[PDB]
Amino acid sequence: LDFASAAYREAYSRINGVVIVGEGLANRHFQMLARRIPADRDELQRLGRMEGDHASAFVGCGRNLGVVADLPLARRLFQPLHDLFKRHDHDGNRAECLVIQGLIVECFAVAAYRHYLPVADAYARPITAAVMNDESEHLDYAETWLQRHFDQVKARVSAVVVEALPLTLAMLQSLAADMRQIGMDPVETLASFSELFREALESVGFEAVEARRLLMRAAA
Ligand SMILES: [Fe+3]
Ligand SMILES: [Fe+3]
Protein backbone atom coordinates (compact mmCIF):
# COMPACT_ATOMS: atom_id res chain seq x y z
CA LEU A 1 0.00 0.00 0.00
CA ASP A 2 1.12 3.47 -0.98
CA PHE A 3 0.69 5.72 2.09
CA ALA A 4 0.97 8.80 -0.18
CA SER A 5 -1.82 7.79 -2.53
CA ALA A 6 -5.05 9.74 -2.71
CA ALA A 7 -7.19 6.66 -1.98
CA TYR A 8 -5.15 5.76 1.13
CA ARG A 9 -4.92 9.25 2.61
CA GLU A 10 -8.67 9.93 2.07
CA ALA A 11 -9.72 6.63 3.65
CA TYR A 12 -7.09 7.13 6.40
CA SER A 13 -8.52 10.56 7.31
CA ARG A 14 -11.85 8.95 7.95
CA ILE A 15 -10.62 5.81 9.86
CA ASN A 16 -8.22 7.90 11.92
CA GLY A 17 -11.13 10.28 12.58
CA VAL A 18 -13.27 7.46 13.94
CA VAL A 19 -10.42 6.20 16.11
CA ILE A 20 -9.71 9.66 17.52
CA VAL A 21 -13.34 10.41 18.32
CA GLY A 22 -13.94 6.85 19.62
CA GLU A 23 -11.03 7.06 22.05
CA GLY A 24 -12.37 10.52 23.04
CA LEU A 25 -15.79 9.09 23.71
CA ALA A 26 -14.29 6.13 25.61
CA ASN A 27 -12.69 8.73 27.94
CA ARG A 28 -16.04 10.43 28.39
CA HIS A 29 -17.77 7.06 28.98
CA PHE A 30 -15.31 5.99 31.75
CA GLN A 31 -15.75 9.36 33.52
CA MET A 32 -19.52 8.96 33.39
CA LEU A 33 -19.09 5.45 34.81
CA ALA A 34 -16.70 6.69 37.52
CA ARG A 35 -19.37 9.13 38.76
CA ARG A 36 -21.86 6.21 39.04
CA ILE A 37 -19.66 3.44 40.49
CA PRO A 38 -18.21 5.28 43.49
CA ALA A 39 -16.45 2.15 44.76
CA ASP A 40 -14.07 2.18 41.70
CA ARG A 41 -14.05 5.90 40.94
CA ASP A 42 -10.24 6.20 40.97
CA GLU A 43 -9.77 3.15 38.74
CA LEU A 44 -12.41 4.24 36.19
CA GLN A 45 -10.92 7.72 36.04
CA ARG A 46 -7.47 6.23 35.30
CA LEU A 47 -9.03 4.10 32.50
CA GLY A 48 -10.60 7.25 31.09
CA ARG A 49 -7.20 9.01 31.18
CA MET A 50 -5.76 5.98 29.34
CA GLU A 51 -8.31 6.73 26.56
CA GLY A 52 -7.11 10.34 26.47
CA ASP A 53 -3.60 9.03 25.83
CA HIS A 54 -4.83 6.62 23.16
CA ALA A 55 -6.57 9.57 21.40
CA SER A 56 -3.47 11.80 21.31
CA ALA A 57 -1.34 8.84 20.19
CA PHE A 58 -3.60 8.37 17.13
CA VAL A 59 -3.71 12.10 16.53
CA GLY A 60 0.06 11.77 16.14
CA CYS A 61 -0.20 8.81 13.74
CA GLY A 62 -2.31 10.98 11.34
CA ARG A 63 0.08 13.95 11.79
CA ASN A 64 2.99 11.61 10.92
CA LEU A 65 1.16 10.82 7.69
CA GLY A 66 0.30 14.50 7.22
CA VAL A 67 -3.41 13.66 6.96
CA VAL A 68 -6.03 15.75 8.66
CA ALA A 69 -8.54 13.46 10.38
CA ASP A 70 -12.24 13.86 9.42
CA LEU A 71 -13.56 14.45 12.95
CA PRO A 72 -17.02 15.78 11.88
CA LEU A 73 -17.78 12.60 9.99
CA ALA A 74 -16.64 10.52 12.99
CA ARG A 75 -18.81 12.56 15.34
CA ARG A 76 -21.68 11.82 13.00
CA LEU A 77 -21.18 8.04 12.82
CA PHE A 78 -20.78 7.79 16.60
CA GLN A 79 -23.95 9.70 17.55
CA PRO A 80 -26.42 6.77 17.77
CA LEU A 81 -24.12 4.71 19.96
CA HIS A 82 -23.18 7.66 22.19
CA ASP A 83 -26.89 8.62 22.66
CA LEU A 84 -27.74 5.11 23.65
CA PHE A 85 -24.99 5.35 26.24
CA LYS A 86 -26.21 8.81 27.39
CA ARG A 87 -29.75 7.43 27.80
CA HIS A 88 -28.59 4.57 29.99
CA ASP A 89 -26.39 6.91 32.00
CA HIS A 90 -29.37 9.20 32.57
CA ASP A 91 -31.39 6.35 34.15
CA GLY A 92 -28.53 5.21 36.39
CA ASN A 93 -28.10 2.12 34.16
CA ARG A 94 -24.48 1.49 35.01
CA ALA A 95 -24.70 -2.17 33.93
CA GLU A 96 -25.76 -1.31 30.37
CA CYS A 97 -23.21 1.50 30.19
CA LEU A 98 -20.52 -1.05 31.13
CA VAL A 99 -21.62 -3.47 28.40
CA ILE A 100 -21.59 -0.72 25.76
CA GLN A 101 -18.17 0.78 26.52
CA GLY A 102 -16.51 -2.03 28.39
CA LEU A 103 -17.37 -5.01 26.19
CA ILE A 104 -18.77 -3.88 22.85
CA VAL A 105 -16.59 -0.79 22.15
CA GLU A 106 -13.48 -2.35 23.69
CA CYS A 107 -13.84 -5.51 21.58
CA PHE A 108 -14.36 -3.44 18.40
CA ALA A 109 -11.22 -1.47 19.20
CA VAL A 110 -9.25 -4.67 19.67
CA ALA A 111 -10.58 -6.22 16.44
CA ALA A 112 -9.82 -3.04 14.46
CA TYR A 113 -6.31 -2.63 15.87
CA ARG A 114 -5.52 -6.34 15.31
CA HIS A 115 -6.32 -5.90 11.61
CA TYR A 116 -4.64 -2.48 11.28
CA LEU A 117 -1.38 -3.65 12.89
CA PRO A 118 0.01 -5.73 10.01
CA VAL A 119 -0.73 -2.96 7.43
CA ALA A 120 0.23 -0.01 9.62
CA ASP A 121 3.12 2.26 8.73
CA ALA A 122 6.32 2.01 10.80
CA TYR A 123 5.47 5.01 13.06
CA ALA A 124 1.97 3.79 13.74
CA ARG A 125 2.73 0.14 14.32
CA PRO A 126 4.45 0.35 17.79
CA ILE A 127 1.88 2.75 19.11
CA THR A 128 -0.94 0.58 17.88
CA ALA A 129 0.52 -2.55 19.51
CA ALA A 130 0.93 -0.68 22.83
CA VAL A 131 -2.67 0.58 22.70
CA MET A 132 -3.76 -3.04 22.14
CA ASN A 133 -1.96 -4.05 25.36
CA ASP A 134 -3.98 -1.50 27.37
CA GLU A 135 -7.44 -2.61 26.20
CA SER A 136 -7.39 -5.97 28.16
CA GLU A 137 -7.31 -3.91 31.36
CA HIS A 138 -10.46 -2.18 30.14
CA LEU A 139 -12.14 -5.52 29.24
CA ASP A 140 -11.21 -7.16 32.58
CA TYR A 141 -12.80 -4.33 34.57
CA ALA A 142 -16.11 -4.66 32.74
CA GLU A 143 -15.99 -8.46 32.77
CA THR A 144 -15.24 -8.64 36.54
CA TRP A 145 -17.96 -6.22 37.48
CA LEU A 146 -20.56 -7.83 35.23
CA GLN A 147 -19.56 -11.33 36.35
CA ARG A 148 -20.06 -10.40 40.02
CA HIS A 149 -23.52 -9.09 39.24
CA PHE A 150 -24.28 -11.60 36.47
CA ASP A 151 -27.51 -12.86 38.05
CA GLN A 152 -29.19 -9.43 38.57
CA VAL A 153 -28.06 -8.12 35.15
CA LYS A 154 -28.17 -11.03 32.66
CA ALA A 155 -31.49 -10.04 31.09
CA ARG A 156 -30.51 -6.37 30.93
CA VAL A 157 -27.21 -7.34 29.27
CA SER A 158 -28.87 -9.45 26.57
CA ALA A 159 -31.24 -6.57 25.90
CA VAL A 160 -28.63 -3.76 25.70
CA VAL A 161 -26.55 -6.03 23.41
CA VAL A 162 -29.57 -6.37 21.10
CA GLU A 163 -30.02 -2.60 21.06
CA ALA A 164 -26.27 -1.74 20.70
CA LEU A 165 -24.84 -4.30 18.27
CA PRO A 166 -26.92 -2.96 15.30
CA LEU A 167 -25.54 0.56 15.81
CA THR A 168 -21.94 -0.68 15.61
CA LEU A 169 -22.79 -2.81 12.57
CA ALA A 170 -24.12 0.34 10.84
CA MET A 171 -20.82 2.10 11.61
CA LEU A 172 -18.87 -0.80 10.17
CA GLN A 173 -20.89 -0.89 6.92
CA SER A 174 -20.33 2.82 6.51
CA LEU A 175 -16.57 2.38 6.96
CA ALA A 176 -16.01 -0.90 5.10
CA ALA A 177 -14.88 0.81 1.85
CA ASP A 178 -12.31 2.99 3.66
CA MET A 179 -11.03 0.05 5.72
CA ARG A 180 -10.29 -1.83 2.45
CA GLN A 181 -8.40 1.17 1.09
CA ILE A 182 -6.12 1.15 4.13
CA GLY A 183 -5.61 -2.66 3.96
CA MET A 184 -8.07 -3.92 6.54
CA ASP A 185 -10.55 -6.65 5.54
CA PRO A 186 -13.84 -5.48 7.06
CA VAL A 187 -15.28 -9.03 6.86
CA GLU A 188 -12.34 -10.52 8.80
CA THR A 189 -12.38 -7.56 11.20
CA LEU A 190 -16.03 -8.27 11.98
CA ALA A 191 -15.18 -11.96 12.43
CA SER A 192 -12.47 -11.11 14.92
CA PHE A 193 -14.93 -8.87 16.76
CA SER A 194 -17.38 -11.80 16.99
CA GLU A 195 -14.81 -14.19 18.43
CA LEU A 196 -13.63 -11.56 20.97
CA PHE A 197 -17.07 -10.48 21.98
CA ARG A 198 -18.25 -14.10 22.43
CA GLU A 199 -15.16 -14.69 24.66
CA ALA A 200 -16.23 -11.67 26.71
CA LEU A 201 -19.88 -12.76 27.11
CA GLU A 202 -18.58 -16.25 28.12
CA SER A 203 -16.28 -14.59 30.62
CA VAL A 204 -19.25 -12.79 32.18
CA GLY A 205 -21.35 -15.96 32.58
CA PHE A 206 -23.26 -16.61 29.36
CA GLU A 207 -23.25 -20.19 28.08
CA ALA A 208 -21.11 -20.56 24.91
CA VAL A 209 -24.31 -21.55 23.11
CA GLU A 210 -26.10 -18.46 24.44
CA ALA A 211 -23.21 -16.19 23.45
CA ARG A 212 -23.46 -17.30 19.81
CA ARG A 213 -27.23 -17.00 19.84
CA LEU A 214 -27.23 -13.45 21.16
CA LEU A 215 -24.75 -12.46 18.42
CA MET A 216 -26.50 -14.25 15.56
CA ARG A 217 -29.77 -12.63 16.67
CA ALA A 218 -28.11 -9.23 16.37
CA ALA A 219 -26.61 -10.20 12.99
CA ALA A 220 -30.10 -11.05 11.69
FE1 LIG B 1 -8.59 3.02 23.97
FE1 LIG C 1 -10.70 1.24 25.85
GROMACS .gro file of N, CA and C and ligand atoms in nm, residues 22-23 26 50-51 54-55 58 101 106 109 113 131 134-135 138, ligand 1:
model
   49
   22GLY      N    1  -1.355   0.800   1.880
   22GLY     CA    2  -1.394   0.685   1.962
   22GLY      C    3  -1.317   0.678   2.093
   23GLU      N    4  -1.187   0.705   2.086
   23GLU     CA    5  -1.103   0.706   2.205
   23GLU      C    6  -1.148   0.819   2.298
   26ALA      N    7  -1.458   0.714   2.460
   26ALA     CA    8  -1.429   0.613   2.561
   26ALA      C    9  -1.386   0.680   2.694
   50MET      N   10  -0.633   0.690   3.033
   50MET     CA   11  -0.576   0.598   2.934
   50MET      C   12  -0.633   0.626   2.793
   51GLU      N   13  -0.765   0.641   2.784
   51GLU     CA   14  -0.831   0.673   2.656
   51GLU      C   15  -0.785   0.807   2.599
   54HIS      N   16  -0.454   0.723   2.445
   54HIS     CA   17  -0.483   0.662   2.316
   54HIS      C   18  -0.524   0.766   2.208
   55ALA      N   19  -0.615   0.857   2.239
   55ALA     CA   20  -0.657   0.957   2.140
   55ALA      C   21  -0.541   1.043   2.086
   58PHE      N   22  -0.310   0.863   1.849
   58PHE     CA   23  -0.360   0.837   1.713
   58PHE      C   24  -0.370   0.966   1.637
  101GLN      N   25  -1.956   0.034   2.662
  101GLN     CA   26  -1.817   0.078   2.652
  101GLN      C   27  -1.723  -0.037   2.675
  106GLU      N   28  -1.481  -0.181   2.350
  106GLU     CA   29  -1.348  -0.235   2.369
  106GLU      C   30  -1.316  -0.349   2.271
  109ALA      N   31  -1.253  -0.208   1.925
  109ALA     CA   32  -1.122  -0.147   1.920
  109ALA      C   33  -1.016  -0.252   1.901
  113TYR      N   34  -0.774  -0.285   1.575
  113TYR     CA   35  -0.631  -0.263   1.587
  113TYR      C   36  -0.553  -0.388   1.546
  131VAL      N   37  -0.125   0.030   2.242
  131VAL     CA   38  -0.267   0.058   2.270
  131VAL      C   39  -0.343  -0.074   2.288
  134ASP      N   40  -0.323  -0.225   2.637
  134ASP     CA   41  -0.398  -0.150   2.737
  134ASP      C   42  -0.543  -0.200   2.742
  135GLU      N   43  -0.598  -0.240   2.627
  135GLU     CA   44  -0.744  -0.261   2.620
  135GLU      C   45  -0.789  -0.386   2.703
  138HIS      N   46  -0.912  -0.274   3.023
  138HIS     CA   47  -1.046  -0.218   3.014
  138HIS      C   48  -1.152  -0.329   3.012
  221FE      FE   49  -0.859   0.302   2.397
   0.00000   0.00000   0.00000
